[PDB]
Amino acid sequence: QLVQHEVLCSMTNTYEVLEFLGRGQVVKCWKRGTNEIVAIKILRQGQIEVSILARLSTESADDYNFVRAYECFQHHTCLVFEMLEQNLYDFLKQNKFSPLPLKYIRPVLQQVATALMKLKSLGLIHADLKPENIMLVDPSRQPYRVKVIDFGSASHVTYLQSRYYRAPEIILGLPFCEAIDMWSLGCVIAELFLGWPLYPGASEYDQIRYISQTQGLPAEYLLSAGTKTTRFFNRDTDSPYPLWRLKTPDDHEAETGIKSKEARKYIFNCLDDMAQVNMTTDLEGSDMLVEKADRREFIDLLKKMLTIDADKRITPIETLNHPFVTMTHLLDF
Numbered sequence: 001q002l003v004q005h006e007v008l009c010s011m012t013n014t015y016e017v018l019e020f021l022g023r024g025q026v027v028k029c030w031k032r033g034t035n036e037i038v039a040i041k042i043l044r045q046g047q048i049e050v051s052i053l054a055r056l057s058t059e060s061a062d063d064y065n066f067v068r069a070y071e072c073f074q075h076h077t078c079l080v081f082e083m084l085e086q087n088l089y090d091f092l093k094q095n096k097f098s099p100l101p102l103k104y105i106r107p108v109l110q111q112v113a114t115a116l117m118k119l120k121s122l123g124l125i126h127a128d129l130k131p132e133n134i135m136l137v138d139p140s141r142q143p144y145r146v147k148v149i150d151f152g153s154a155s156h157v158t159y160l161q162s163r164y165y166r167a168p169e170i171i172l173g174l175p176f177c178e179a180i181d182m183w184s185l186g187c188v189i190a191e192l193f194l195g196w197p198l199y200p201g202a203s204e205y206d207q208i209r210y211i212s213q214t215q216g217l218p219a220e221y222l223l224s225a226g227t228k229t230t231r232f233f234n235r236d237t238d239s240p241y242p243l244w245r246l247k248t249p250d251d252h253e254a255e256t257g258i259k260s261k262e263a264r265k266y267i268f269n270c271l272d273d274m275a276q277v278n279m280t281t282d283l284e285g286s287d288m289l290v291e292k293a294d295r296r297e298f299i300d301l302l303k304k305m306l307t308i309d310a311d312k313r314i315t316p317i318e319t320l321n322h323p324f325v326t327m328t329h330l331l332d333f
Ligand SMILES: O=C(O)c1ccc2c(c1)nc(Nc1cccc(Cl)c1)c1ccncc12
Pocket: 021, 022, 023, 024, 025, 026, 039, 041, 067, 081, 082, 083, 084, 085, 149, 150, 151, 152
């Protein structure tokens, strides 16, 4: 867990520490001799990280919108990163949790989907995509330019992801791949759209309960394959063709001690019902057709990212081709 004060020595530079950033740990340091401020992270989970940072060090961090890693050096192994400004949670919070308009959501989506495409091409799973792991480079001089950070959970093709952004296959204990990151991306853009997480479950039970209430139960063939399914669902009869039912909150609390909570600011009966919420009424004529068409494309993309079966879930390349991202739906105006 190390300690603090001032200064550290690289294999190629020297870094004076100025400020603690959070708990491995991350610290803000001055690249001595330059005008650069950098973020240094001080950590087998480190071996996997450095290797993946290495396999990406050869790729274009700016082109694919993932954080630039400069050098690795032991001192405890340290990792030097470019300094970013603000993660998406602090952005929303600093904005009093008001919705983000779609026109600003679109370029964030496009940059993160691009990074996911780069990761899928290298056979890599990020496994911790979430608003804290997406940072605005400079919200004032480069508005809405973002970098994906934190490959500490990353892996090549258990208990993964941050719970609000966790895919059904991880909740249920199914086989999985890089598709889990696309589910997290859907939860991220929905949250920018709402100003609040879509599925803020306080436990894995509440998480799959929220998802099931808005999207229906996962299909029987998924439930029957999951190693964790019976923690949250009962077979009302034996297979073949069990009648799968979600445990009720009272029943689930009774056998578990976990009390269910209500953490949602919005409860949708289905994802289509999102399309209308928080729209500007003042829009006149052709501007409102634009907005209504933008929202239809956005929920259409959102539903394909939040497809419960990972085999049917849209891929990064295909979202980069979706009209919400490309804006071909707006040419009809
Ligand atoms: O892991 C990385 O790749 C990683 C890479 C870059 C940053 C980071 C983590 N964490 C930051 N802040 C932060 C905020 C809260 C908790 C923690 Cl542990 C760290 C940060 C800030 C400014 N610029 C780059 C970073």
